[PDB]
Amino acid sequence: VTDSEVTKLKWSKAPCRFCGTGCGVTVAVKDNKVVATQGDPQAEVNKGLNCVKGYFLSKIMYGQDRLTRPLMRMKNGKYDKNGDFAPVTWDQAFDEMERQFKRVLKEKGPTAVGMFGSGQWTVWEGYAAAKLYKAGFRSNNIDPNARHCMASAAAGFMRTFGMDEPMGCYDDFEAADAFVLWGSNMAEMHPILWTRVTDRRLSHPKTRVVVLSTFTHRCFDLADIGIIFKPQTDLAMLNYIANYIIRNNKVNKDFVNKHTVFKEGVTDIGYGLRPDHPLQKAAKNASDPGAAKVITFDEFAKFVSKYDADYVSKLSAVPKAKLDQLAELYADPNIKVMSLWTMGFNQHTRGTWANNMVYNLHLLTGKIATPGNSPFSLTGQPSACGTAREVGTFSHRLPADMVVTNPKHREEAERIWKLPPGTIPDKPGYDAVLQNRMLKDGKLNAYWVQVNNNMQAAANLMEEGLPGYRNPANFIVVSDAYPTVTALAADLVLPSAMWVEKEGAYGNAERRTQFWHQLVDAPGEARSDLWQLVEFAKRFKVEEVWPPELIAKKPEYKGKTLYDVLYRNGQVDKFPLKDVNAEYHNAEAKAFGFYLQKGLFEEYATFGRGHGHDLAPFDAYHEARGLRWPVVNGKETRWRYREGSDPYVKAGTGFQFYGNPDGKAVIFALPYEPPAESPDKEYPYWLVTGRVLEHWHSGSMTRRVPELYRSFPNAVVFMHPEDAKALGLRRGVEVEVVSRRGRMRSRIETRGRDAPPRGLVFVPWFDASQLINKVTLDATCPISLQTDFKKCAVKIVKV
Amino acid sequence: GLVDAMRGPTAIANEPRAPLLYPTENKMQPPTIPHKIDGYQLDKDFNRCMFCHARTAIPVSITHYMDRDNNVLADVSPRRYFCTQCHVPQADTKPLIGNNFVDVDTILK
Ligand SMILES: Nc1nc2c(c(=O)[nH]1)N[C@H]1C(S)=C(S)[C@@H](COP(=O)(O)OP(=O)(O)OC[C@H]3O[C@@H](n4cnc5c(=O)[nH]c(N)nc54)[C@H](O)[C@@H]3O)O[C@H]1N2
Ligand SMILES: Nc1nc2c(c(=O)[nH]1)N[C@H]1C(S)=C(S)[C@@H](COP(=O)(O)OP(=O)(O)OC[C@H]3O[C@@H](n4cnc5c(=O)[nH]c(N)nc54)[C@H](O)[C@@H]3O)O[C@H]1N2
Ligand code: HEC
Ligand code: HEC
Ligand code: SF4
């Protein structure tokens, strides 16, 4: 950071702990305390700026109630599901987890153990956990909070391009002529990327900013064209624009002919509910919901021709004139368009289709993989990309886009992990929604949650999560830095080291992996999630977790532990303690006796190197403020799939979508289909849920910071003033928000930053005293299994 | 032997009474805003903050008139135009839990 020999503070670089923007910060330390952070002037993402959350990073680790000791439910001197929590030692906590996991593995097997992880894990935490479950316990029941977030984007990428994550980058914000926000609230949710859109718009005022949303929020304060549309009608609007492009003869014939093919997907695919729900019994195509057939351009044009202006304007409530203004930006071949979307497209019961359908617009016009012409899916968490998606900490995944169902992918993971053939389970395990259902049903019985607060974050708390966690057939372990409602619903709570109390890596929304050193020591006996996974692996011999016919294939593993197999395997332990930079602590390298993070990262990086996902050498990331993959011959890649920018693209081609075997991207014909639950006479409002600028997620870190808590103390129900008048409400009056599943209590805000149309309310989810996920429905896109938290039906009742 | 002060004493299964909506306090880090901001327009056609805080209320510092290349400009930079991304007002209420943060001045003396 600084060359100086006279600062009394030690300043070091790190990525921000919060959003997927991935601002670089510098962090000042003295006497084991972070006393300040600043935006890093040398970081390209943010060039010295932060938002209010990044400016209060110096306070997030110092809530007075940080967890410092393992806490286990006990009564009469032993573990008891009904006991209250008591302090125990690490050895006692692990002894109990060991007894519980072993009992369950023996009686039920690996489909009855699981983990719920995180896009806030460090890259090496995610990788170590994926190894422990998929190669160690041989369970694919590891899924992350990022299933609630980016799984529709990832499914959309794999279907259109055959490879995950954006092909543009943040340099596109300085080159676009139109920005189209498809429900993203960037002003509050990606504030420094909104600063880059604002600089582009105000400094180059021919630029257009178009914001589409189901309620008015702060992005409308920059919008040239604001569009409020009915929930889920974005599918119809996306087809309207495809139809406009074709109708006005604005298809890029050369690009479409060289570089695309067309498919038509299956429809009537249900809503990812339990199989006995009426919506599932009624659905024709729920059992293979991503199926598609090849069609021609002419069939595609006939398909989208049904989405004409009369039908779309009436369905969406958007005037024809605004539909045409928006479609014209897409169609005009001289306007570079950056399309941006976040949970409005992904937390959507047809979210995978919406992802495909926004790619259609760029593929019809060839506006892709070049500066400013960029369909850019925004990622939420700091490492939903770098950790959950790239490492593959999902129930169907292996690293580097691979899937457990592909026997060549299992063979590659077995080769790199030095496992006997057939170790890796070949069927997808329980994804996030299904994990809560299986906990409720008694089929998932030993469960470990890390770096998330899924009791607060998962939909339908009263019907699935809470009954599942408190089922006496189940033993629930939660690792957290603070008390949370998820830890309160657990049986064993493990105190965890967070952010700069450990060496880390996060990968942001534009493929930038950013490292940090451990800059301070955690309080009390708190230890990293990394240390916990690796230490727990010591408690299991291969005979206890692998079947005999598997061990017979690799008899050298007889008698060894999973710690030996997974972490001390000649690869993960190949960098000695001398490689550790002696200027910083490294608690896990000291505990295990080698450079664990470097060995994990380099073994993990073997999957992507030479296979389109290349990570640079470990040490390069401690030197840089992030590098964007693929890093090839030490050069980062900004635009993927574009000749001259991406070194994997064949000469003479212009573009090559090499994730697909023919090199072509797919354009999909897909329809509008309605939400799982819309308002009716009994529940006449739409409930939309989400976030505000000043709090992160469940608020367990930001609402412990004095300034952030005081900036927005409690959730509220944002309501149209005339809707409040009609219910006999004033601002500040208490209501219940009630659905068919549960209720919560909160006060009405009729003059706040979020101003919904009549019939719709917005409730942010950061307040642990106002559990809005008691009200939401755990319906999902049937393809990505991602929950739609953005619409369901509610009644509002004056208390 | 465990409580979450962000929720308060209420069982997960029940719903507490919501606290009152507290008024805003009129009183390295971006200073917090020691006044209400609810009637203050902040949009691309009008920045009401700049009516009192322009360099022509203490004014915004020179860093607010700098572009991404640190050139100083005649007017507020677009990169700081939306002030409330960084400056927040404060409810007239106490925090829910103590926080052991120590600032630079304190750690240095
Ligand atoms: N301040 C803050 N920033 C964050 C986070 C945080 O907790 N706090 N979390 C990060 C994470 S992990 C995420 S995933 C992002 C989420 O970032 P966003 O998705 O931008 O924000 P939310 O508040 O979750 O979602 C509200 C948006 O959903 C859109 N929407 C609702 N229904 C529909 C619909 O039918 N179609 C479409 N197209 N849009 C719809 C609404 O118009 C509204 O703008 O924020 C990231 N950044
Ligand atoms: N209704 C509704 N629900 C939603 C959303 C929505 O828009 N509406 N958004 C969904 C989405 S997109 C997402 S990403 C999820 C996010 O939901 P979560 O990830 O469940 O929420 P967080 O509060 O980010 O949880 C992170 C936890 O990590 C803890 N902690 C911090 N650092 C560490 C560490 O290093 N180790 C450990 N072990 N713990 C640590 C924190 O105290 C906190 O409890 O929420 C989803 N849920
Ligand atoms: C006059 C009618 C004002 C308008 C409009 C805005 N502010 Fe203000 N502000 C005003 C006064 C008289 C004061 C106290 C004097 C002082 O500068 O402290 C302030 C204070 C602030 C501060 C604190 C600055 C500091 O002392 O370090 C900030 C950060 C602030 N005001 C921001 C701010 C914002 C973002 C505004 C629009 C939403 C805004 N102010 C409008 C007077 C007036
Ligand atoms: C983050 C990217 C910011 C934005 C947007 C705005 N301000 Fe700011 N401000 C910010 C920082 C980190 C600081 C402290 C360091 C400094 O630059 O001085 C400030 C400071 C102020 C002040 C106090 C100035 C002083 O002399 O002490 C004021 C009155 C102020 N800021 C107001 C303000 C206005 C009105 C904004 C929108 C036009 C604005 N700030 C945006 C960080 C950020
Ligand atoms: S924009 Fe995101 S990454 Fe940047 S400081 Fe704010 S929360 Fe952190």
Side-chain angles (χ1 to χ4, degrees), chain A residues 156-291:
Chain A
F157 278 116
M158 291 303 296
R159 282 160 54 84
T160 293
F161 302 103
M163 176 170 326
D164 202 11
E165 278 172 37
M167 59 298 300
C169 62
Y170 291 166
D171 295 45
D172 289 325
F173 285 109
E174 285 73 49
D177 300 316
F179 294 95
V180 186
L181 277 71
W182 282 94
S184 298
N185 181 353
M186 298 183 69
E188 292 192 82
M189 271 47 89
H190 291 88
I192 280 291
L193 302 190
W194 189 242
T195 294
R196 292 172 75 161
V197 167
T198 300
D199 205 358
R200 180 62 173 162
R201 173 57 183 80
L202 298 186
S203 297
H204 301 276
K206 300 168 178 204
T207 299
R208 306 284 78 177
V209 171
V210 175
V211 179
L212 296 104
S213 185
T214 62
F215 58 96
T216 298
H217 50 58
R218 283 178 176 179
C219 293
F220 288 74
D221 293 334
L222 182 67
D224 296 297
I225 296 166
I227 292 163
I228 299 298
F229 64 94
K230 288 189 162 151
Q232 195 112 332
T233 68
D234 48 2
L235 297 172
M237 294 163 90
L238 288 167
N239 282 348
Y240 178 70
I241 299 166
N243 189 29
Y244 180 105
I245 296 169
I246 292 166
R247 283 172 63 85
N248 286 101
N249 189 32
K250 298 285 180 200
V251 179
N252 185 332
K253 169 186 189 173
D254 187 65
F255 181 89
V256 165
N257 285 359
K258 283 175 172 160
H259 302 305
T260 74
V261 293
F262 294 86
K263 294 186 196 298
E264 183 174 346
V266 294
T267 63
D268 188 20
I269 49 169
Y271 294 90
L273 288 163
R274 285 173 174 268
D276 202 63
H277 189 100
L279 291 176
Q280 299 306 305
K281 285 158 100 142
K284 171 191 278 83
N285 294 316
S287 62
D288 183 12

Side-chain angles (χ1 to χ4, degrees), chain A residues 16 18-19 21-23 50-51 53-54 191-192:
Chain A
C16 178
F18 296 123
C19 79
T21 299
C23 300
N50 279 151
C51 67
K53 304 185 297 307
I192 280 291

